[PDB]
Design a protein around this ligand. Structure first.
Ligand SMILES: *[C@@H]1O[C@H](CO)[C@@H](O)[C@H](O)[C@H]1NC(C)=O
Lengths: 48, 48
């Protein structure tokens, strides 16, 4: 609920948490009992 | 020739002063610092 705010200084800090956006979930291609469960000619990952 | 010419050149001694012969020099002023801070958790960026 504001406009652009220019600053003279950039003092910023980050705090961690356990919300879903903090986790990177992946899967393998050709992985047994998973999505894309078929023979692959290359070892690549897939998003989850 | 008498009653003619008679030109006068005068050397007035205004003042005698003991002037200074400067050697090295530098400049200075008033300074104030400004700091930008950024806090990151371990293994983030270069937080090793
Ligand atoms: C995760 O952290 C930084 C990114 O902020 C990255 O440079 C680093 O290599 C990563 N650490 C791993 C992959 O272990």
């Amino acid at each position: 609920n504001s406009k652009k705010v220019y600053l003279d200084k950039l003092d910023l800090k980050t705090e961690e948490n356990l919300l879903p956006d903090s986790f990177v979930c992946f899967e393998h291609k050709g992985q047994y009992k998973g999505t894309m469960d078929s023979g692959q000619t290359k070892r690549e990952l897939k998003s989850f | 020739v008498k009653e003619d010419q008679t030109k006068f050149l005068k050397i007035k001694t205004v003042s005698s002063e003991l002037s200074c012969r400067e050697g090295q020099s530098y400049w200075t002023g008033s300074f104030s610092p400004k700091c930008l801070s950024s806090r990151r958790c371990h293994l983030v960026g270069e937080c090793h």
